[PDB]
Design a protein around this ligand. Structure first.
Ligand code: GNP
Ligand code: MG
Ligand code: MG
Ligand code: MG
Ligand code: MG
Ligand code: MG
Lengths: 113, 120, 102, 209, 195, 122
RNA sequence: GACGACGUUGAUAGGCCGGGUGUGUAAGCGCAGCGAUGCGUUGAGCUAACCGGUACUAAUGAACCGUGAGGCUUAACCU
RNA sequence: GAUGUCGGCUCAUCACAUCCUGGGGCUGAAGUAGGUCCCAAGGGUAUGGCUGUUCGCCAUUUAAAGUGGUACGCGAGCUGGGUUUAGAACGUCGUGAGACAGUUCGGUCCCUAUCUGCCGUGGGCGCUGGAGAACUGAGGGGGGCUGCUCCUAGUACGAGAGGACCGGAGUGGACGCAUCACUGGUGUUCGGGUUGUCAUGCCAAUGGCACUGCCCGGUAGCUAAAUGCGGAAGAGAUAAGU
RNA sequence: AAUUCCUUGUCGGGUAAGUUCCGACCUGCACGAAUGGCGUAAUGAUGGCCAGGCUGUCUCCACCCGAGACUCAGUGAAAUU
RNA sequence: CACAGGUGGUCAGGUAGAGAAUACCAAGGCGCUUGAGAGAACUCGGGUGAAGGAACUAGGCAAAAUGGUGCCGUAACUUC
């Protein structure tokens, strides 16, 4: 009750709804101490922990032949814009099995909707 | 160490607990009055009362779901037909516990548990 | 400061006789800076003198460097001026580390 | 100066303008009312007795009812004493608000930590578990040796073994306060405070630098 | 070490001690060996022993290590002398003694510019004009008794070391004064300035 | 984390392929190495024509960690594989001429700009 | 053991409602396909211990223990 | 008349003849860094390879990897590698049975705590009418570690190399306390997938068993590898010393 | 060396680091040819060493599921003294 | 001892399985002569575990891991 007052008053009301397994662009604010510039991060989301203000989602990228996993906070001010190009078709909330199988053999399908 | 944890063990594993409650839940609704120990009766309410609430609405899906518990068609048959209308106008508290002392064999806390009206 | 530190650093390095001054306008290829300057050092003592000169003038200018690396060894020393990284290195280090890739 | 006494409602993060997340503890403080003020002439030391919250009339017995009625204050959950700082003065019946913590910027939180019951030597005193293999027999989390041979011939006091752990007064010092709210009666303190949700907490200005 | 260019730290000829080897303890406990003693020496020094002495080695580059005295051998305990002939060995062997050696260090000047002039010439005062070394300068002959160093740093990148040498007289060739021994600190300077 | 007796990959083209973090520097009873740390490694697999050989002992800087890197906003930077950059023993300078793979921003804080400058990623 | 909250003048526990969370498109219906299977109903169904409400159920009128002004002497005041 | 020994693990405690941190004197103490001596026991005082090893050598860190006592601390706390009853073998000795402060392979480690002790938690009574609370504090216990960077300052010193005392600010290692806000682990009481088989008359749909049958996630709680805090500053009297 | 006290003999391999192991030398206290000498494929719940996968063996333990321990009711020992 | 031990022969169903293994069942027989609570330390039998993967230890002890059919392919040595 008392906690929810700070929860509602601090969350962002412009968070898009994205299904697990979709391709998501995340624009984050990076600071060198002097200037603020936007850094892009393209990858497929594999896990979403949507729980109030503490909501978070895990996205995975294959860069330079190496897999990198990064989590984001949906209500933190570090992110700037969340966009989705392709919507995946997987019947699982968690997509942790993508780590083992290689990317060329782990092509996800589209929901066609 | 039981911080905000619910669900008593009754010196049984998960399989025996589920079966014993399932057998006892069907026996209670069949007779409307059974005598069992206080801890067994107190955890039985967390089984039969949700089952009665599910039985408040009659549908093909609910009956099949209700059949998955108590694994007996006759128990499901009595539900949705007898205990449905009686508890339709009641919001919870379908069962009550009546303490009745202790057994002479092992000295255990004894208690009856029954429905609200029992139509008797 | 922008588009002015580019000329400010070149002036400071050329004030202490830097050779073969090159400026790389890495606008988007690198995610840490906006432009880069690479300069040559005649000797080991010259490289340290160039690095100290550019750091000292930056403090008077109003920007504190984030750090330096090539202190003990003068083969290659870097200065972090915020949006600009300036490399001053010896004659040999500019070929072993080929900085035309970015 | 003095502090406040309140109740912890939970923990939550605070997001800053630069994106840094500050995990804070939310403490609700009700307007404390002074029940007694002590003096050198009567008690030999200066303190004020305060109370917080409300308590049911039936539960409140006559002895403390007269205690509350003497000061003109209603019932309260509990009573506490805060020591004064040689020059600050309070009167009987004065309500204590929360805005006085707008300058301390450093608070000390005391409270009864969570009760873990009878804890073993490994859990309580952070001992080292013995090997689980290589022939070990019935001794994995046991304390081991508890003394020397017959020359001491006894076990010294203060020796570390199993016992009741937690459920005792614990003080966390130098906790940064983030925000204070008067109209809502909330206090945001950076870090984690002892005790569980809903427990009574005593907050005081920091004594160290 | 490249950094050192003088032997001022060894003009008092301290006695350098390598610690006594740990005595063999009972119950087959082998004593620890004493830690090595390293003496910091400049580059180009000559190593000479007193009594049938020879040049053991010449310093060449930084980090070069030279052995001067090897430590004594350990004393074997009674575990090492049991056999069928004697089964309860009471014999003990003393450790071999360390090497007591006298060392002479000869160093030549490492300066780049050497000066040679008469005592009336301003050799010492020229160091003051080119550097900040503050040697003794006065209006009398033979003011300086030992060679002194000086570094001329007009730019950070480039510098050179210049040394002033005590003056010499007409009769200095055969001797009877300071001799010609202070010209030994030469032949290493690239140029020999003459005043 | 990164502790002693850990197989480690290489993020540079020095010549090694698989090394062993076998001692972590920083202080007494040092248990783990973070993302920016100085560690002692031994070469376990290297190219015969590379700048380093088999069995050499030298210093390395962590670049990527399996566990991740904690950002000041509760964000982790996970990776698939543990990599390091080889350094000279006496002077902590990179031996390789290139960096292969992404590098975290945390090296910027600890004044490791050699790796950050010539790394074609973060 | 003990400590804490409540006992009808009550939200103490259970149940119920709403919400959240987790899993993932329930059963049934019809269509496509010989079939496996997919599709619309549908981010549906279910959801433990978590949050906010609600006396529906259980916390009975009671009875037990615990008293009736609290010793002597001296000192400072009150009659 | 008996497992009782060495080593290792767990747990420590005490002394100072002090390894580091602290305060100094002399110096053949320019500085940094060292040599010797005095006071000082508050805290801290390494990971691996070899061997059973204590000890050692080696590799690499740290400020250091201190010296000893405590039945060479601790086996009714653990281990049984060393040695070692009964087996066997090699070398040597003896004609032989056999033996060897010679070596090698294998070879049962029991105890439900009566008392003192210690760690926690209660009942009775007392404190002089009874009862409910809140405190002062006689006393006791816990903690006290320190690396690196920057400014001072490339200043004092120093020909240069090198490089200060005092003071201030950050950032780490180990230890302790607290918490679950984030990241995770667990989560056999939640959901789903799937194999074999049986049952619910049969199809569909479920349930039982097969380690929770095997797996995928995961609520709360607990928890660390996760994040907050702490070691003080100051005051009084002092040791060596001035 | 199942045999060597000196011994962790000397050199090399393996390891960042090897009193163990393997390969060469023989200074065999105290090998030696049916109380058999050397080699030997296969075999061995045989002794010693190394490598790959694998893992709570460990860094460093945490949680969970059951059986005791704990409380109540019934029956009711033992060593020792 | 109403004892987790030992004791020869015969009968030998269904499903899946090569099988008298193994898993669930048929006929048949049982729930093992102390129960009821709560889910402390600790002990025993198990499940899972971030990062590392023998760094533990006398020793990979114990655990963990592999495990089937078909096809391809398979080294030194050798008594072939
Ligand atoms: N005006 C002037 N006087 C000079 C100059 N050079 C030297 N002098 C004078 O002449 C004196 C010569 O003494 P000095 O220079 O010390 O001689 P030195 O170099 O020490 N030689 P030595 O070591 O053999 O005695 C100087 O002390 C100074 O009084 C110069 O350039 N100008
Ligand atoms: Mg300047
Ligand atoms: Mg420098
Ligand atoms: Mg002169
Ligand atoms: Mg300098
Ligand atoms: Mg410096």
């Amino acid at each position: 009750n008392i906690i929810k007052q700070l929860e509602q008053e601090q969350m962002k009301q412009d968070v898009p709804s994205f299904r697990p397994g979709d391709t998501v662009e995340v624009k984050v604010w990076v600071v060198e101490g002097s200037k603020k510039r936007l850094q892009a991060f393209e990858g497929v989301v594999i896990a979403i922990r949507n729980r109030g203000l503490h909501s978070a989602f895990t996205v995975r990228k294959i860069s330079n032949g190496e897999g990198v996993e990064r989590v984001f906070q949906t209500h933190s001010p570090v992110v700037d814009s969340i966009s989705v190009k392709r919507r995946g078709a997987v019947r699982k909330a968690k997509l942790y099995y993508l780590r083992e199988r290689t990317g060329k053999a782990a092509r996800i399908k589209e929901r066609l909707n | 160490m039981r911080h905000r944890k619910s669900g008593r063990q009754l010196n049984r594993n998960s399989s025996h607990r589920q079966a014993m409650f399932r057998n006892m839940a069907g026996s209670l609704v069949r007779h409307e009055i059974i005598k069992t120990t206080l801890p067994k009766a107190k955890e039985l309410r967390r089984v039969v009362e949700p089952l009665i609430t599910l039985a408040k609405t009659d549908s093909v899906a609910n009956r099949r779901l209700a059949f998955a518990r108590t694994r007996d068609n006759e128990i499901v048959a009595k539900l949705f037909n007898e205990l449905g209308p009686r508890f339709a106008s009641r919001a919870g508290g379908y069962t009550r516990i009546l303490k009745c002392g202790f057994r002479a064999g092992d000295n255990a806390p004894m208690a009856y548990i029954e429905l609200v009206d029992r139509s008797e | 400061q922008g588009k002015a530190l580019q000329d400010f650093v070149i002036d400071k390095i050329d004030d202490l006789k830097g050779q073969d001054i090159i400026a790389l306008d890495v606008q988007g290829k690198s995610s840490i800076t906006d432009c880069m300057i690479i300069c040559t050092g005649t000797s080991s003592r010259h490289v340290m003198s160039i690095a100290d000169h550019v750091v000292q003038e930056s403090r008077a200018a109003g920007l504190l460097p984030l750090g330096v690396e090539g202190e003990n060894s003068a083969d290659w020393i870097v200065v972090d001026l915020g949006d600009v990284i300036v490399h001053v290195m010896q004659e040999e280090s500019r070929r072993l580390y080929e900085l035309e890739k970015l | 100066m003095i502090g406040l006494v309140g109740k912890k409602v939970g923990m939550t993060r605070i997001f800053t303008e630069d994106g840094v997340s500050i995990p804070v503890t939310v403490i609700e403080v009700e307007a404390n009312r002074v029940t007694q003020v002590k003096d050198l002439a009567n008690d030999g030391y200066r303190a004020i007795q305060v109370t917080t919250g409300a308590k049911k009339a039936n539960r409140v017995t006559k002895p403390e009812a007269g205690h509350f009625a003497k000061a003109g204050v209603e019932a309260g959950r509990g009573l506490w004493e805060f020591r004064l700082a040689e020059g600050e003065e309070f009167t009987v019946g004065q309500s204590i608000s929360v805005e006085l913590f707008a300058d301390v910027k450093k608070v000390d939180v005391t409270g009864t930590s969570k009760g873990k019951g009878f804890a073993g030597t490994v859990k309580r005193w952070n001992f080292r578990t013995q090997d689980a293999t290589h022939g070990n027999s019935l001794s994995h989390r046991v304390p081991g040796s508890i003394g020397q041979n017959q020359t001491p011939g006894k076990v010294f006091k203060g020796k570390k073994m199993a016992g009741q752990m937690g459920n005792e007064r614990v003080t966390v010092q130098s906790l940064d306060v983030v925000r204070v709210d008067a109209e809502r009666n909330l206090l945001l303190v950076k870090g984690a405070v002892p005790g569980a949700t809903g427990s009574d907490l005593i907050v005081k200005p920091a004594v160290k630098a | 070490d490249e950094n050192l260019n003088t032997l001022i730290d060894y003009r008092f000829e301290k006695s350098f001690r390598a610690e006594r080897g740990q005595n063999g303890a009972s119950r087959d406990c082998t004593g620890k060996r004493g830690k090595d003693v390293t003496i910091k020496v400049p580059v180009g020094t000559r190593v000479i022993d007193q009594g049938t002495g020879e040049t053991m080695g010449d310093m060449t580059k930084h980090g070069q290590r030279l052995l001067v005295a090897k430590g004594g051998w350990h004393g074997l305990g009674n575990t090492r002398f049991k056999s069928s002939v004697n089964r309860t060995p009471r014999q003990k062997t003393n450790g071999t003694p360390g090497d007591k050696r006298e060392l002479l260090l000869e160093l030549m000047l490492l300066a780049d510019v050497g000066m040679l002039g008469m005592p009336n010439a301003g050799k010492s005062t020229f160091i003051r004009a080119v550097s900040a070394a503050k040697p003794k300068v006065a209006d009398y002959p033979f003011t300086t008794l030992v060679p002194s160093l000086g570094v001329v740093r007009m730019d950070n990148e480039k510098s050179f070391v210049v040394a002033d040498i005590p003056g010499l007289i007409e009769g200095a060739a055969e001797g009877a004064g300071l001799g010609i021994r202070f010209l030994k600190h030469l032949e290493r300077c690239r140029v020999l300035l003459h005043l | 984390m990164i502790q002693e007796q850990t197989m480690l990959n290489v993020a540079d083209n020095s010549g090694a392929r698989r090394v062993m973090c076998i001692k972590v520097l920083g202080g007494s009873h040092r248990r783990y190495a973070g993302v920016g740390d100085i560690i002692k490694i031994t070469i376990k697999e290297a190219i015969p024509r590379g700048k380093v050989k088999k069995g050499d002992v030298l210093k390395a800087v962590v670049v990527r960690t399996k566990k991740g890197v904690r950002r000041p906003d509760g964000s982790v930077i996970r990776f698939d594989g543990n990599a390091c950059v080889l350094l000279n023993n006496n002077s902590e300078q990179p031996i390789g001429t290139r960096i292969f793979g992404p590098v975290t921003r945390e090296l910027r804080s600890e004044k490791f700009m050699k790796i950050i400058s010539l790394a074609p990623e973060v």
